[PDB]
């Protein structure tokens, strides 16, 4: 299992997100924003989003190195969510 970029398209949304610059990391040394939880009955599940996916872009909004609140706001303001992620 190594890294692979994917775009996931979602239609709450049953994902919890963790991490971000200046925030408690999700794992080891990484300050990225991650999918911490995926509830089996959400549009993100049928879109294929997976726990541990690192968020890179939400509808053009770049989240690489963004703070937590940035990702929260970007996600709520996005019907269609072209969600670019890095997955191991």
């Amino acid at each position: 299992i190594e890294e692979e970029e994917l775009t996931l398209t979602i239609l709450g949304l049953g994902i919890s997100i963790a991490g971000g610059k200046g925030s408690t990391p999700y794992k080891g040394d990484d300050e990225g924003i991650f999918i911490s939880r995926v509830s089996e009955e959400g549009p993100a599940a049928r879109a294929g989003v997976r726990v541990g996916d690192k968020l890179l872009e939400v509808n053009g909004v770049a989240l690489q190195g963004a703070e937590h609140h940035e990702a929260v706001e970007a996600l709520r303001g996005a019907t269609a969510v072209q969600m670019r992620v890095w997955r191991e």
């Binding site: 049953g14 919890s16 997100i17 937590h68 996600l75």
Partner: peptide, 5 residues
């Protein structure tokens, strides 16, 4: 922090 979006 975990937010449910």
């Amino acid at each position: 922090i975990e937010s449910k979006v």
